[PDB]
From a paper:
Psilocybin, the natural hallucinogen from Psilocybe (magic) mushrooms, is a highly promising drug candidate for the treatment of depression and several other mental health conditions. Biosynthesis of psilocybin from the amino acid l‐tryptophan involves four strictly sequential modifications. The third of these, ATP‐dependent phosphorylation of the intermediate 4‐hydroxytryptamine, is catalysed by PsiK.
Here we present a crystallographic analysis and a structure‐based mutagenesis study of this kinase, providing insight into its mode of substrate recognition. The results of our work will support future bioengineering efforts aimed at generating variants of psilocybin with enhanced therapeutic properties.
Numbering used by the authors: 0 to 362
């Protein structure tokens, strides 16, 4: 077994040709990222590999971090890689009848040389990019995105209940690193309020409940990072008016947890878009999602828990996104903190809960 140098272009082509037998363009290679630990290469092949002529390779360098940090990084990789393999295997029952939602295929993961190979998607723009541009994303396209992601996420949650005990599914229940990241995120709720003048003494309790659910729930399988910054859109190469594919990119946090976590992320992000970008794009998208999610899911939504999930997203993300002005952001977070009182009080005239019911109505 040879030691290879994946930090140089020449060592890259040795690894690809000598170890994996790939026919590599010596001039189809470009570095994308690179610090002390990680490197990302974009690569063009002269002959296909698992159907693909272009791929990316990521590489962690050992001995450039503590032993503890390097170990957790590898764990994150494996869950990301294995999550993507699970969706490739369940492509048929998830990607639906005529559906366009998909995951960038994972091709190879070499734990000996710390080298992961994935499908190269292209230089596609995120959803987040399309909804912040002036002008914004056509509304016909926003409806379809909502309808497709709702149906994917519902099919995901359905299969995760019925295959809960199969061992490849239980593997993700054990993604403790992934559950801990969720926890750390929920801990910023009280700081982010405090910073904006809000200081409600309910928040301790609400945080406690969110943290326990995420550390202990085994309800279903959740994508766990379903916001617009982690979603790519492939538009027709020419007509900017026809959607071809939606890709969900980062699956590191995939795990067992409550269904409401996925609804909170995405509906939450819709609320942010409605308020600070385009009301019709954010609102179409929200409603389309709720419409298809409610038709496909084999369990009823819990409106209190989704209301609180949305509140959580609002308080955790308003500052990060850095939209509008200080003053407006303060009042938006205040509406979030208000929505926690509506969840705990089971109040169906609450501003958020009430909307949820209307937009997910059947007839
Ligand atoms: Cl390809
Ligand atoms: Cl396991
Ligand atoms: Cl702005």
């Amino acid at each position: 077994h040879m030691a290879f140098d994946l930090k140089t272009e020449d060592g890259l082509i040795t690894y690809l040709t000598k170890h994996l037998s790939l026919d590599v363009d010596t001039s189809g290679v470009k570095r994308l990222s690179g610090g002390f630990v990680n490197v990302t290469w974009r690569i063009k092949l002269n002959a296909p590999y698992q159907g693909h002529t272009s791929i990316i390779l990521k590489h962690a360098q050992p001995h450039m971090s503590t032993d503890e940090d390097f170990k957790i990084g590898v764990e994150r990789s494996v869950y990301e890689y294995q999550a993507i393999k699970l969706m490739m295997a369940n492509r048929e029952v998830l990607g639906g009848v005529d559906g366009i939602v998909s995951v960038p295929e994972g091709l190879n993961y070499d734990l000996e040389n710390n080298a992961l190979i994935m499908q190269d998607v292209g230089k596609m723009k995120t959803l987040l990019d399309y909804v912040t541009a002036k002008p914004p994303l056509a509304t016909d396209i926003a409806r379809l995105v909502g309808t497709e992601i709702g149906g994917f996420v519902a099919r995901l949650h359905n299969i995760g209940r019925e295959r809960r005990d199969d061992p490849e599914f239980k593997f993700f229940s054990g993604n403790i690193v992934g559950r801990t990241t969720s926890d750390q995120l929920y801990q910023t709720i009280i700081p982010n309020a405090a910073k904006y003048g809000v200081d409600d003494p309910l928040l301790p309790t609400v945080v406690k409940d969110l943290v326990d659910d995420v550390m202990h729930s085994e309800e279903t399988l959740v994508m766990a990072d379903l916001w617009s910054g982690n979603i790519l859109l492939q538009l027709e190469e020419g007509n900017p008016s026809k959607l071809q594919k939606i890709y969900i990119l980062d699956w590191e946090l995939c795990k067992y947890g409550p269904a409401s976590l996925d609804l909170g992320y995405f509906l939450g992000d819709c609320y942010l878009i409605s308020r600070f970008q385009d009301e019709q794009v954010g609102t179409t998208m929200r409603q389309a999602y709720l419409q298809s999610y409610a038709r496909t899911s084999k369990h009823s939504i819990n409106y209190a828990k989704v209301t609180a999930g949305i509140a959580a997203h609002i308080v955790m993300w308003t500052d990060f996104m850095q939209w509008g002005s200080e003053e407006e952001r303060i009042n938006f977070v205040k509406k979030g903190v208000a929505a926690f009182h509506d969840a705990r009080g089971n109040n169906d005239n609450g501003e958020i809960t009430s909307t949820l019911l209307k937009e997910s109505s059947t007839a």
